[PDB]
Amino acid sequence: RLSLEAMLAERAMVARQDLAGLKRKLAGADRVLAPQSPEQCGRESAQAQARSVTSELKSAVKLDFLEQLGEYPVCGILHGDHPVHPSGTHNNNGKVSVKRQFAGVNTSDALTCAFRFEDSDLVRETALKDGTWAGFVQRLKMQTTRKCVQEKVSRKLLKQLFPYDPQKLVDVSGELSELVLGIKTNAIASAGPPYWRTKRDALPDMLDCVLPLLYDHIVRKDLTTLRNKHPELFLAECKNKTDRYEVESLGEKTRPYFSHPFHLSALVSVLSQSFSGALKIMTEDSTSFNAYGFSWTNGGAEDLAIWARQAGEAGKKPPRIACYGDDTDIYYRKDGKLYRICPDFKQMDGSVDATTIEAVVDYVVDAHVKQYPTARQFWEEVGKLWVEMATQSPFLIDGTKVYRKMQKDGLMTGVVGTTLFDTVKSALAYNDWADQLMFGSLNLLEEKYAIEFFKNKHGLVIKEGTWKPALVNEDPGFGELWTEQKFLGLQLKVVRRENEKVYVPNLPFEDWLTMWVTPRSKETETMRERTLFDRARGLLVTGAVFDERARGLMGAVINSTAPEVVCMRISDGYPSYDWVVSLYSRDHPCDMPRVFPEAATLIASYRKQVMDTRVVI
Amino acid sequence: RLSLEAMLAERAMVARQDLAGLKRKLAGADRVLAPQSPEQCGRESAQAQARSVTSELKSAVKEHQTLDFLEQLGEYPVCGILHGDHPVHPSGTHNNNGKVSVKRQFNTSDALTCAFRFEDSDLVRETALKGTWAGFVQRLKMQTTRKCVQEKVSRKLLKQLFPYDPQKLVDVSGELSELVLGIKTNAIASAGPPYWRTKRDALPDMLDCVLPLLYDHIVRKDLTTLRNKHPELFLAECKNKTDRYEVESLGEKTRPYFSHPFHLSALVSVLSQSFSGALKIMTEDSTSFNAYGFSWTNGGAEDLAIWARQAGEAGKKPPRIACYGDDTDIYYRKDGKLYRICPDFKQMDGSVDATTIEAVVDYVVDAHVKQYPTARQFWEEVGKLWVEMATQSPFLIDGTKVYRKMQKDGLMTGVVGTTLFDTVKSALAYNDWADQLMFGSLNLLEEKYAIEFFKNKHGLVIKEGTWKPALVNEDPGFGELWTEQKFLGLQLKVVRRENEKVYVPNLPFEDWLTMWVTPRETETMRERTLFDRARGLLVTGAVFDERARGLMGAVINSTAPEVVCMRVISDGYPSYDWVVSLYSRDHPCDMPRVFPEAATLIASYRKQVMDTRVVI
């Protein structure tokens, strides 16, 4: 027995798979059109301008530093019917291999849209802003060869800067496989060697074959044997992966990435993800220097302001410092006036010293094994493995040659805990920075002295422009900005909802358009239209809704995208001003307003007619 | 993004669709084997036994009536209503020379084979032995021609006998389409004319084409025009459907069923299903004569016992009478001694008078339109349509000839409210019966006098054997029965859990085996059907009969692991402890899983115990 609504919903889900039928069912559908900027150009003209800039830009596009280890044999581990290393993949004469992919980034689809609905001039300029083999190696060299400063760090200092709740920690004393089942990762991401499959496809092989083998050798202290017998089990894969690398920049850059094996990453992820849950951010505990895990939504932006205004006079009282990897937010007072600095660090990953990494892993491991003392020995061995993964893991750039980092110092970007390690290093530097301030070195507020201090004493290079101390709008009227500075890539601003003020992130329209234009078989036509649609929704949610011009451009793309792409398998909602303001406020979560309100019924071949039983005659 | 456990669950669901791969993953799976009776016969030896009895059974089945009793209304044209690219009447079905037509067709050894192997061959033979077109016509004739007596019925009497909670009533004042979307029906069932498709396939066409047209003519009082223009919209389809018409017979019988159109059925279902929710059963309110909606589970069996022992002395105090369609449970006291009668009415549907049908339709509508007065007229018109459906709907038995019932009296089985209509008729009879008892006509406790009362006064025929009053074991010792009589097809029994007593339904193994032998295309589906049927009987109380528990457990254990854990899904078995927890007031729990670790195995994962608490 099934309700007619349920029978209709079931039909809707089944009919969503046919894009052809979706067009027919949604022909004259009522559409909730979002705010849209008027069309500045024609279709064929925005296409032509886009093609021009794309071609012109694309025409401009055209290992002894590493320790060189031998070539690695493919591991012969067999799980039932199939080898854990698939036959005919990443195998050159019995030795593991990899092919350089120098990848496709979709840049002309977004360019066309921006040309049509925005200024042709401004679109042209912001577009002109690469990562080939040469650039990849240079960036690799810098990261792996940078000299670092070892930091004076103790467990006590790490308890102050990074408080945690011990009761919130996962009971790591229980069975390992259940623990590994609890961790979350991207199923489509590569599992690495020896699987060379997606984590989803390789999950059985890892969980019942490789990881048990790893565990048995850990507990017998026989890990050296495993390295000789099956060396692919510990090998990583260096790739050039386009991701959101500097926290200061929401924009995506293509930089070296290290893909460690699934069994190693997952086993370490137990500790990492558990610590993330228990770790406290600056708003929860004032002592924390930690911003890792801070979200602007559900009042986070307001809480950052509340926490920032508790800063004290430099010298007399403690400042407010929050670090999220490379990016940090500093709040101090001079003669009772709130000041804000939003400093950033260049490279960062290459600048993290090995005593910090060892201290973070010790801190994480100690926390778990303190609350759950029955499993001390095991995870201490896991901690040693984490350090190997972060510093000296063997990796495969191109071909069959295996490489290793010559210096222990320097972080292997992409290891579990990458962002945590960065956060700790920065916090350690800025903690000492505040200590010298209380000592009586207030010159360190000035750009010259500060940038020198962090380079000399803590081995960290401050990005030019980021040390620009500015006065703060502590009591901001409707529409005003906190400061023009960017923390976590966004500026804090105040917006009006009824009579209350809602703290929300903002950026200038120029930065929004740049993010729109930045490029990110792999070739499908209808997929292209959905990509532009979801990116527009995403930018709107991230704060482009608050900039007037940006709202129009994103709103234009939302309204331009076909009903078939909007309601497909599926989310068919659009970010409205009102919804986005509720997101960043302490309001209970809401679902996005639906673009096509009558879509649910229409896709189930039902055209609702209103039959009124109330007014009857 | 996704937890590794969640990724494995996704793998589990996707891999269930491949039954071939299921056995491979489930090769050496640990199975929780249910209690099972030993195999008395060999595979093909019991098979031959089954085949033999099968043919001999057909030797009795396989070894006349006119149609003039019905009013003959001629041929109905196929309705030309079209929605978009496709007409509401599909091309090439149920249509001869432009006129609506119907072709109807007027051997299941699988269960017999299983019963032959695991139980005594003789008893299987005997229970197996215990009429197509001709039988259908005679049964049709009976219900349509039976003489009925009109009942003295008012809303006042119906409020006493059938209390409801008005706040539980659906807001019938709102928009109709939302209201009809809320009703629940069988999607695989036939939508009837003119769709001639499953309700699922016809649901859009009904909702956007036919139902609006109906509503537009309803509000214009122009329904007569619609009947003439498109007569197939009001036509029903009489068929021989294997269903549970007799509620005392848990077994399915093949009897006449009337399949009304979807738009008519769904529109009326709004009121009927809404009233069903608000209706109160006998345990909830002692004044209620209503047993429709009674469930034995969650203490229902005990709740019936508690309510029944509240009966009073015949004459001085009011009895406890509960009616569920034809079946009724009567409790009275003589010298302080509890007695139980379990009477049934034969035919029943044909014996329900039209003034009763009209009064309940009034009762349902009045309830809705009193609490929600703004839609008074509309649902009053729907009520007029409801009465037409229960009494004088045109129907199509075989071929193109249309028929109608000659008398308004008599219920057309299959209309919305069928069981409610019958329940009310019975309640009216037993209320007057109780009035005669309090007045001083206690001679009606005897079978002879009572049957006369119900035939003469209320036009109701009691099948002989159903009126055999028996003393009741008010406090039944562990294992003992309430009485040997069958209410709602089952006997009440007491079973022991710890020191507490759990009132549970029971039947003799013979009756359990009978239900096993009577049923209703691909081989693996057959094996799954046997699995679910065995589980169902266990849950219905066959777990409590020793022999029946064994045979049912045998079929469960015989079912292949691929068939047990497949997408239907449900991979659990009814255990003794689980079933007692079901019928008791225990919070609901899930069935014990046949293969406990199957969930992980289907995702190609064998659980590893790797202990982090290791000493090293």
Mind listing the domains of chain A with CATH numbers? 78-103+141-279+350-415 (3.90.1730.10)
* A contact test, residue of B612, B613, B614 with most A CBs within 10 A: B612
Distance from CA of B593 to the nearest CA of A (A): 20
Known binder of ligand: residue A327? Answer: yes
Asked whether B578 and B592 are in contact (CB, 8 A), the reply is: yes
Rounded to an integer, what distance in angstroms lies between the CA atom of residue A512 and that of residue A518? 10
The enclosing H or E element of A277 equals helix A262-278
Residue B461, C-beta contacts closer than 8 angstroms, at least 6 positions apart:
B345, B346, B347, B351, B451, B454, B455
Q: Fill in the amino acid letter for B298.
A: N
Q: Enumerate the residues of chain A whose CB falls inside 8 A of the CB of residue B215.
A: 611
Q: Phi, psi (5° rounding) for residue B505? A: -75, 145
Rounded to an integer, what distance in angstroms lies between the CA atom of residue B569 and that of residue B565? 7
The residues that bridge with B86 in the sheet, in sequence order, are B83
Radius of gyration of the CA atoms of chain A, in A: 27
Rounded to an integer, what distance in angstroms lies between the CA atom of residue B347 and that of residue B362? 24
Taking CA atoms, A247 is separated from A138, A293, A429, A490, A518, in Å, by: 21, 12, 18, 10, 16
Residue B362, C-beta contacts closer than 8 angstroms, at least 6 positions apart:
B155, B383
Taking CA atoms, A444 is separated from A432, A437, A439, A448, A454, in Å, by: 11, 7, 11, 8, 10
A416 secondary structure, DSSP code: T
CB neighbours of residue B392 within 10 Å:
17
Q: Fill in the amino acid letter for A120.
A: S
* B contact test, residue of A1, A2, A3, A4 with most B CBs within 10 A: A4
Closest Cα in chain B to A175? B611
Rounded to an integer, what distance in angstroms lies between the CA atom of residue A326 and that of residue A423? 7
A575 burial via Cβ count (<10 Å: 0-12, 13-18, 19+): buried
Known binder of ligand: residue A207? Answer: yes
Residue in A221, A375, A605 nearest the CB of B612: A375
Residue A191, C-beta contacts closer than 8 angstroms, at least 6 positions apart:
A197, A198, A199, A201, A202, A203, A206, A261, A262
- Cis status, amide bond into A343, omega within 30 of 0: no
Q: Enumerate the residues of chain B whose CB falls inside 8 A of the CB of residue A173.
A: 612-613
Q: Phi, psi (5° rounding) for residue B219? A: -75, -15
Resolution of the structure in the document, Å: 3.0
Closest Cα in chain B to A604? B204
Cβ-based contacts under 8 A for chains A and B? 155
Distance from CA of B601 to the nearest CA of A (A): 10
**Which two three-digit tokens encode residue B134?**
């001709």
Rounded to an integer, what distance in angstroms lies between the CA atom of residue B278 and that of residue B290? 12
Closest Cα in chain A to B615? A377
Residue in B1, B174, B184 nearest the CB of A3: B184
Known binder of ligand: residue A370? Answer: no
CA atoms within 13 A on the CB side of A306: 13
Q: Enumerate the residues of chain A whose CB falls inside 8 A of the CB of residue B613.
A: 173, 374-375, 378
- Cis status, amide bond into B194, omega within 30 of 0: yes
Asked whether B31 and B565 are in contact (CB, 8 A), the reply is: no
Residue written as tokens 């009776």?
B37
The enclosing H or E element of A79 equals strand A78-79
Max alpha carbon distance in chain B (Å)? 93
Taking CA atoms, B561 is separated from A216, A415, B9, B28, B528, in Å, by: 33, 42, 19, 10, 10
Q: Provide the Cα torsion B250, B252, B253, B255; round to 10°.
A: 110
Residue in A175, A182, A184 nearest the CB of B611: A175
Q: Fill in the amino acid letter for A273.
A: Q
A168 secondary structure, DSSP code: G
Q: Enumerate the residues of chain B whose CB falls inside 8 A of the CB of residue A222.
A: none
Residue written as tokens 């040469």?
A134
Q: Fill in the amino acid letter for B598.
A: A
Rounded to an integer, what distance in angstroms lies between the CA atom of residue A447 and that of residue A466? 9
Rounded to an integer, what distance in angstroms lies between the CA atom of residue A450 and that of residue A471? 18
Residue in B375, B607, B608 nearest the CB of A614: B375
The enclosing H or E element of B432 equals helix B418-439
Rounded to an integer, what distance in angstroms lies between the CA atom of residue B22 and that of residue A433? 63
Rounded to an integer, what distance in angstroms lies between the CA atom of residue A74 and that of residue A96? 5
The residues that bridge with A329 in the sheet, in sequence order, are A322
Known binder of ligand: residue B432? Answer: no
**Which two three-digit tokens encode residue A54?**
């794309």
**Which two three-digit tokens encode residue B197?**
């498709």
3-state secondary structure of A344: coil
How far is CA B495 from its chain centroid? 26
B59 burial via Cβ count (<10 Å: 0-12, 13-18, 19+): exposed
Distance from CA of B374 to the nearest CA of A (A): 5
Known binder of ligand: residue B329? Answer: no
CA atoms within 13 A on the CB side of A507: 26
Rounded to an integer, what distance in angstroms lies between the CA atom of residue B391 and that of residue B411? 6
Rounded to an integer, what distance in angstroms lies between the CA atom of residue B271 and that of residue B12? 42
Q: Enumerate the residues of chain B whose CB falls inside 8 A of the CB of residue A183.
A: 3-4
Q: Fill in the amino acid letter for B428.
A: L
Residue in B4, B208, B374 nearest the CB of A614: B374
Strands A2-3 and B327-334: unpaired
The alpha carbon dihedral of B525, B526, B529, B530 has a sign of: negative
* B contact test, residue of A206, A210, A381, A613 with most B CBs within 10 A: A613
Residue in A7, A377, A381 nearest the CB of B187: A7
Q: Fill in the amino acid letter for B69.
A: F
Q: Enumerate the residues of chain B whose CB falls inside 8 A of the CB of residue A215.
A: 610
Closest Cα in chain B to A172? B612
Q: Phi, psi (5° rounding) for residue A502? A: -115, 115
Q: Enumerate the residues of chain A whose CB falls inside 8 A of the CB of residue B604.
A: 204, 208
Closest Cα in chain B to A176? B610
Rounded to an integer, what distance in angstroms lies between the CA atom of residue B108 and that of residue B114? 12
Q: Enumerate the residues of chain A whose CB falls inside 8 A of the CB of residue B8.
A: 181, 203
Known binder of ligand: residue A436? Answer: no
Taking CA atoms, B505 is separated from B338, B491, B538, B550, in Å, by: 20, 6, 11, 17
Residue A138, C-beta contacts closer than 8 angstroms, at least 6 positions apart:
none
**Residue B293 zone, left/alpha/beta (φ > 0; ψ -120 to 50; rest):** left
Residue written as tokens 């990953």?
A349
Rounded to an integer, what distance in angstroms lies between the CA atom of residue B59 and that of residue B81? 48
Q: Do B219 and A617 touch (CB under 8 A)?
A: yes
Distance from CA of A185 to the nearest CA of B (A): 5
Strands, DSSP E only, in A448-582?
Answer: 470-471, 491-497, 500-506
CA atoms within 13 A on the CB side of A467: 17
Among B5, B515, B129, B236, residue whose Cα is nearest residue A184: B5
Distance from CA of B201 to the nearest CA of A (A): 9
**Which two three-digit tokens encode residue A597?**
């309100």
Q: Enumerate the residues of chain B whose CB falls inside 8 A of the CB of residue A605.
A: 204, 208
Q: Enumerate the residues of chain A whose CB falls inside 8 A of the CB of residue B176.
A: 611-613
**Which two three-digit tokens encode residue A181?**
């089942």
How far is CA A157 from its chain centroid? 27
Asked whether B201 and B93 are in contact (CB, 8 A), the reply is: no
> Exposure pattern of A75-97 as b/e (b: 16+ CB <10 Å)?
bebeeeeeebbbeeebbeeebbb
Instruction: Find the length of chain A.
Output: 617
For chain B, helix (H) and strand (E) counts, in that order, are 23, 14
The residues that bridge with B401 in the sheet, in sequence order, are B75
Q: Phi, psi (5° rounding) for residue A425? A: -55, -50
Rounded to an integer, what distance in angstroms lies between the CA atom of residue B241 and that of residue B216? 33
Taking CA atoms, A135 is separated from A61, A347, A405, A519, in Å, by: 11, 15, 19, 17
**Which two three-digit tokens encode residue B37?**
């009776």
Q: Do A609 and B266 touch (CB under 8 A)?
A: no
3-state secondary structure of B2: strand
Asked whether A572 and A558 are in contact (CB, 8 A), the reply is: no
Rounded to an integer, what distance in angstroms lies between the CA atom of residue A474 and that of residue A482? 7
Q: Do A212 and B608 touch (CB under 8 A)?
A: yes
Rounded to an integer, what distance in angstroms lies between the CA atom of residue A468 and that of residue A457? 21
3-state secondary structure of B120: coil
The residues that bridge with A330 in the sheet, in sequence order, are A321, A341
Residue written as tokens 């040390």?
A467
3-state secondary structure of A545: coil
Q: Enumerate the residues of chain A whose CB falls inside 8 A of the CB of residue B375.
A: 613-614, 616
CB neighbours of residue A306 within 10 Å:
12
Among A561, A562, A509, residue whose Cα is nearest residue A535: A561
Among A259, A238, A195, residue whose Cα is nearest residue A403: A238
Among B408, B410, B400, B69, residue whose Cα is nearest residue B235: B400
**Residue B221 zone, left/alpha/beta (φ > 0; ψ -120 to 50; rest):** left
Rounded to an integer, what distance in angstroms lies between the CA atom of residue A415 and that of residue A349? 11
The enclosing H or E element of B403 equals strand B401-404
Rounded to an integer, what distance in angstroms lies between the CA atom of residue A175 and that of residue B399? 69
Q: Do B182 and A4 touch (CB under 8 A)?
A: yes
Residue B84, C-beta contacts closer than 8 angstroms, at least 6 positions apart:
none
B162 secondary structure, DSSP code: S
Instruction: Find the length of chain B.
Output: 616
Q: Do B182 and A266 touch (CB under 8 A)?
A: no
Q: Do B1 and A606 touch (CB under 8 A)?
A: no
Asked whether B270 and B257 are in contact (CB, 8 A), the reply is: no
The alpha carbon dihedral of B35, B38, B42, B48 has a sign of: negative
3-state helix, strand, coil in chain A (%, to 5): 45, 15, 40
Q: Do A182 and B1 touch (CB under 8 A)?
A: no
Asked whether B360 and B420 are in contact (CB, 8 A), the reply is: yes
Residue in A4, A174, A187 nearest the CB of B203: A4
Q: What would the DSSP string read from start to end of A29-66?
A: ----PPP-PPP-S-HHHHHHHHHHHHHHHHHHH--TTS
**Which two three-digit tokens encode residue A70?**
């031998």
Distance from CA of A584 to the nearest CA of B (A): 22
Asked whether B546 and B156 are in contact (CB, 8 A), the reply is: no
The enclosing H or E element of A91 equals strand A91-92
A247 secondary structure, DSSP code: T
Taking CA atoms, B501 is separated from B488, B497, B509, B583, in Å, by: 21, 6, 22, 11
Among B12, B11, B33, residue whose Cα is nearest residue B561: B33
Q: Do B184 and A2 touch (CB under 8 A)?
A: yes
Taking CA atoms, B589 is separated from A17, B194, B575, B593, in Å, by: 36, 44, 12, 12
Among A520, A487, A491, A519, residue whose Cα is nearest residue A503: A491
CB neighbours of residue A272 within 10 Å:
19
Q: Do B608 and A11 touch (CB under 8 A)?
A: no
Distance from CA of B464 to the nearest CA of A (A): 36
**Which two three-digit tokens encode residue A88?**
């005919």
Rounded to an integer, what distance in angstroms lies between the CA atom of residue B364 and that of residue B383? 9
Known binder of ligand: residue A326? Answer: yes
Q: Do B612 and A7 touch (CB under 8 A)?
A: no
Residue in A181, A610, A616 nearest the CB of B377: A616
Q: Enumerate the residues of chain B whose CB falls inside 8 A of the CB of residue A204.
A: 11, 603-605
The residues that bridge with A471 in the sheet, in sequence order, are A339
First to last CA, chain A: 34
Asked whether A132 and A102 are in contact (CB, 8 A), the reply is: yes
**Which two three-digit tokens encode residue B589?**
């729990």
B232 burial via Cβ count (<10 Å: 0-12, 13-18, 19+): buried
For chain A, helix (H) and strand (E) counts, in that order, are 23, 16
**Residue B402 zone, left/alpha/beta (φ > 0; ψ -120 to 50; rest):** beta
Asked whether A150 and A428 are in contact (CB, 8 A), the reply is: no
Residue A188, C-beta contacts closer than 8 angstroms, at least 6 positions apart:
A198, A199, A200
Q: Do B7 and A200 touch (CB under 8 A)?
A: yes
Asked whether A504 and A546 are in contact (CB, 8 A), the reply is: yes
**Which two three-digit tokens encode residue A258?**
């290290």
B315 secondary structure, DSSP code: T
Q: Provide the Cα torsion A533, A534, A535, A537; round to 10°.
A: 90
Radius of gyration of the CA atoms of chain B, in A: 27
Rounded to an integer, what distance in angstroms lies between the CA atom of residue B414 and that of residue A508? 69
The residues that bridge with A243 in the sheet, in sequence order, are A253
Distance from CA of B5 to the nearest CA of A (A): 5
Rounded to an integer, what distance in angstroms lies between the CA atom of residue A55 and that of residue A59? 6
Residue A515, C-beta contacts closer than 8 angstroms, at least 6 positions apart:
A250, A251, A539
Strands, DSSP E only, in A266-360?
Answer: 320-324, 327-334, 337-341
Check chain A for breaks (C–N over 2.5 Å) and list the residue before each, or none: 62, 102, 129, 520, 569
**Which two three-digit tokens encode residue A560?**
């331009």
Q: Do A185 and B4 touch (CB under 8 A)?
A: yes
Rounded to an integer, what distance in angstroms lies between the CA atom of residue A412 and that of residue A427? 19
Among B2, B3, B5, B60, residue whose Cα is nearest residue B599: B5
